[model samples]
Target chain A: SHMKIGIIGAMEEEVTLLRDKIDNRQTITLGGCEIYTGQLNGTEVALLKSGIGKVAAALGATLLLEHCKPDVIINTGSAGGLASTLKVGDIVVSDETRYHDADVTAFGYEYGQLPGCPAGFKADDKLIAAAESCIRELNLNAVRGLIVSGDAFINGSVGLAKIRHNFPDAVAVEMEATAIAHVCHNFNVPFVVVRAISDVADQQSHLSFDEFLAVAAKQSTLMVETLVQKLAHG
Target chain B: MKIGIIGAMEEEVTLLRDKIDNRQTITLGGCEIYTGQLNGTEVALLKSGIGKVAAALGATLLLEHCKPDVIINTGSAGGLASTLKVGDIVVSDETRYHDADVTAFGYEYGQLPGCPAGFKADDKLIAAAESCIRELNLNAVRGLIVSGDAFINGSVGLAKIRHNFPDAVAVEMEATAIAHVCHNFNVPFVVVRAISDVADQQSHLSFDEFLAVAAKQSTLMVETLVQKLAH
Candidate 1:
């Protein structure tokens, strides 16, 4: 059976197009989330703009789980490229997501690991497979690997080296995916994150993020919609 | 409808917890809620553990399950507004996350996307809290409060906070998050905190020294505010 999808975006800049694509949309504001519930491409979906950072996304994800109860969740957003080879607008699907800043190591967890949570939130293989196939079918530049999140933005500041050292294989860094992933972990939901690189670990690009945000988010949006198509057509 | 009150620790909420009539406890995700009447007014209270996430989770549960009419976050803080001294009270006009820096996209410092730079407290709640503090003749002031995941102890750390939020009167781990939750739910909320310690080079040690029994002013303030709200 084709499954219902729950989509989460962190900022208006990244989600405006997706919101516009929702047919017969009814938006509800609940528990700090602006949830858009309706049909997209003849598939069921509940999308939300969850603000920024961990606490914000966690609350939004929890509300989505409680209200929408989707069969799976797809976080479509923009992030900063973490790998040297990645460039602006490259797609990075989450093989897993972890907090780039949840340092509880003093008490023996891994650097990004929070107490009681896995070192990283593993993405569901099926959802990831759908995402990967969709991205390739669309001919978009993409990679699948670890994505990290924290309250801080990376712009060649102090934690960049530490994050690179800690999760050398990380492809992208953003503020909300791991949080939504964490909530999904606790809620026993299958989820995947599809993000486009808004900045290329490039300090200068942070300034132009607004100008390029829609384009970057469109990459993730296309992947999300195609995954929706896979659900409807398969 | 019952009022919701959240504090970050057992000590901060003990007195209010102890005064309830026909108190009953509910446990959700290891966070405890005590519900009953306090001086003839219906109240639901929770010790929200600590930090932004815990407080946000606690508030979510309390608001969703309990459905309180208003939320009052009462706790202790490291006073950042220069005039504050240990034992003084700070009623929040607004709350911000000092640790949330998303300025890369032209948002204000301490502001989150889709949120105001400062989460404004309910005007009437603030008025009532300030009035009650005056009625009780406590040393109190109304100002902005900030929260973050990290402890601001060193003078260097505090200098940056003071620089960023010039009006911040108190700093703690949870108010902005609690405020954030209430804001999302469109619930009226206010933060009432007592200065347990002052932020400075001596802050960590000073916090340990002072908070041993410093919920005094906070308790009195809440008690007074509850009485005002009851009528």
Candidate 2:
């Protein structure tokens, strides 16, 4: 069997659309896995609606890696855009994500590592570039920069400020990208994150998310379809 | 200034409560701290609860909120007994709660090395514990002590100790967390442990039962040392 592309999302529309779009079909089942595999872009794909938050996302990615054994996993979701250039419907290819919830200050490190920190997870550079190229080829209005992920659904200035301070170059914020990235990086699986800008790091951005969730989900599904196709062919 | 006694269970506590008589005054902190002058000493005695996490919280309150000059943790522990014996008293120069493993935090092997896994107690405090042991004619051993959260009886055996820590004299669960927190805050602290039972493969003793015996012995040591706190 060919390597499958696993598409995971938190919202319903994004996952349902992904399941609808894929082509070749093979059921993927493993420990704690409920995958609905289908075909997308002439390649086998396993799509799942991983529930909200980091824990669920991590478990979903771990199960996908264990069961489907995808050549690559694409985390398609929505996030709050921190960069001014990021507007509604803008896509983001995460260069790296800082787990803002992690306390690196508590643990000191010696030289020859990212200094003044305990530890963190970084995205695969090759996969990151591949996703970036997909965005450019599609000519999607997108920005590539660091994303910050945490366990909590934070939509306030305090949460945004902490993420901005820790990752001064962060372009967006989300809840599960870092966790999925952490698990995938540990398992040596190449991973890419594509988030549709659902909101900005402001009050209007926060209020608009609930109202624009359906639009955000549709936008994420579109990006996922384009990105998954590129991933299959390239 | 007052002396504090912190323990996890009821063993040594009853004896200390009976032996050390002082006026009990309550303070208006989040947790009410007992304050009173020692029976024959200038300082008072504050007995905090047990376990490293609780011990750290209590010690922090005692130092920052209660305002104590010196802190001493006297309790009963399990002896690996490879070279030590039951009823032998050990004064820890350094403590390591060997089980505070954070490998998931991407800390490489031995990355977050602590103060020898045991923070050293002040010389004066060490001398005080020494005199209490000698005057009472008790068998006293001094070396590294490994503190853990769980009892190592079924978890770890003697051969494992010899293989991992050859110099370890005794092992307790909460002392290392207590010592580590004290070290961070620069408060002078010492842990004096009496071997109530040996933590060997065949020793099948219940913690609650053995703690009572250990606490009685710990109270004797505390009494001798607390008296010397004045002198």
Per-residue CA lDDT of candidate 1, range B1-231, in tens? Answer: 579999764665888889889999987554678999988989899987556765776788788778999998887788886667777778899999987766666888878777888899999999998888878777768999998766565578778889988878888878998999998889999898878767652444455456555666667667778878877
TM-score of chain A of each: 0.95, 0.86
| Candidate 1 lDDT, A140-230, residue by residue in tens | 8788999988887777665678778888989988888987887787667898998898886556657647667877887778877888778
Off by over 4 Å in 1: A20-24, A101-120, A133-140, A157-169, A229-234, B12-34, B81-83, B131-138, B201-212, B215-220
Candidate 1 CAPRI grade = acceptable
- Superposed on all Cα atoms, model 2 deviates from the true structure by an RMSD in Å of 20.8
Candidate 2, B97-168: lDDT as tens digits: 444322222333211322243467777887788778878878888777876433455334545654566677
Residue B230, candidate 1: alpha-carbon lDDT = 73
Candidate 2 lDDT by residue in tens digits, A103-166: 3232243211122222445666877777777777778888877777654444555666766666
| Candidate 1: residue A35 Cα off by (Å) | 1.9
* TM-score to native of every candidate shown: 0.84, 0.49
DockQ comparisons of all candidates to the true complex: 0.36, 0.02
